[PDB]
């Protein structure tokens, strides 16, 4: 028995009903939201409380996307009230063999770390370096020598914010990982893809024509 | 499906679910099906808030999402109750929230101490005599013995570092 029945999770609207419970909460299976308060409230009273501008504002619905879950189709329009699985599909397909290379992730170094074995520097303070996932999660992070590169992390550190799309689309093959690396290189050195840079080696004329 | 219902699945399965794959025989007459499960890797991560390593069963997708979020604590906080179907997840979430509140309290304590030290430094910036120094010390409610001990400790640390 429930002495107190919780109300609908998101019922801020004064005239329109709450969205389907699965959109805001964590239980799917229904495409139409309902609110006993709104249903019982007389139509004249709801119209009195609301105003034409407010009525239109609360009527405006984002279609086909969802208002609460950005970048996902709302469940009330899908063939079934459960969320679309195309975006949140499992990492590995049923028949896909696991062939994922040793991906590298961006890490901001909080202190100048000197590799004594190699006689070099892993990275300078407040600098971003692409390192091994296992290395980062096993040695750098626990030692507090570096942290993952996130826009929020950059904001906290005060450095210029860069949205490294880390694991935005996990590669599933070495070729896909190479494509991801190429896209990252492009996004980083966009200036290297200009026509002038592409023809830099032909800045003035053919080397053979050029005198010695 | 999942091995256990959402309120009982102790392991962290973000979106991986048990799926049956179907394969026809050499002759297309008959078919055999077999269930397949995700690769469960024990994620031994380190949480800055807790300052101590925490290990929990996870999946490769979970590890990748943790790396995306830039921290185990951030991943747990981003994932909501229904979205994170792990009792272990809820326990670590509560521990992380308590530890975060402790971090905030410690920062407030440090700020209060900084304000107090600044005020007393303004009060006693000149050096006049031990009598007036003790008067200000008792005005601000401080023990000379522990003041001297911490001064000596700071001097020892300074000498050691340089």
């Amino acid at each position: 028995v429930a002495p107190w029945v919780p109300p609908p999770r998101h019922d801020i609207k004064v005239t329109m009903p709450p969205p389907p419970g699965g959109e805001v909460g964590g239980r799917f299976g229904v495409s139409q939201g309902y609110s006993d308060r709104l249903a019982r409230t007389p139509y004249w009273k709801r119209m009195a409380l609301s105003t034409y501008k407010l009525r239109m504002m609360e009527n405006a619905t984002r279609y086909p996307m969802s208002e609460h879950r950005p970048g996902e189709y709302d469940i009330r329009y899908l063939p079934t009230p459960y969320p679309c699985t195309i975006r949140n599909r499992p990492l590995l397909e049923v028949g896909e063999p696991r062939q994922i290379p040793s991906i590298r992730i961006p890490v901001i170094f909080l202190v100048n770390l000197f590799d004594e074995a190699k006689g070099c520097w892993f990275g300078r303070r407040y600098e971003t370096v692409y390192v091994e996932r296992q290395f980062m999660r096993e040695e750098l992070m626990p030692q507090r020598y570096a942290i993952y590169a996130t826009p929020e992390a950059y904001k906290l550190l005060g450095l210029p914010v860069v949205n490294h799309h880390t694991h935005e689309e996990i590669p599933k093959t070495p070729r896909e990982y190479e494509k991801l690396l190429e896209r990252q290189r492009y996004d980083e050195e966009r200036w290297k893809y200009t026509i002038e840079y592409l023809f830099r080696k032909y800045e003035d004329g053919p080397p053979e024509l050029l005198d010695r | 499906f999942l091995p256990k219902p959402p309120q009982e699945m102790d392991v962290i399965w973000l979106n991986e679910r048990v799926r049956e794959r179907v394969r026809t025989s050499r002759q297309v007459q008959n078919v055999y099906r077999q269930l397949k499960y995700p690769y469960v890797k024990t994620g031994i991560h380190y949480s800055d808030v807790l300052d101590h390593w925490v290990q929990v069963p996870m999946v490769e997708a979970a590890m990748f999402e943790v790396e995306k979020d830039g921290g185990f604590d951030n991943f747990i906080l981003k994932r909501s109750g229904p979205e994170l179907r792990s009792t272990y997840g809820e326990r670590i979430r509560r521990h992380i929230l308590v530890r975060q509140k402790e971090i905030q309290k410690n920062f407030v304590l440090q700020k209060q101490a900084q304000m107090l030290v600044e005020s007393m430094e303004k009060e006693i910036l000149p050096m006049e005599d031990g009598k007036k120094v003790e008067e200000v010390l008792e005005k601000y409610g401080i023990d000379k013995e522990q003041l001297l001990r911490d001064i000596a400790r700071a001097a020892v640390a300074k000498k050691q570092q340089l």
Partner: peptide, 14 residues
């Protein structure tokens, strides 16, 4: 400045 090898520190307590 700081120095560290590739296996000096282990996350777990060995």
């Amino acid at each position: 400045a700081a120095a560290a090898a590739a296996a000096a520190a282990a996350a777990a307590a060995a």
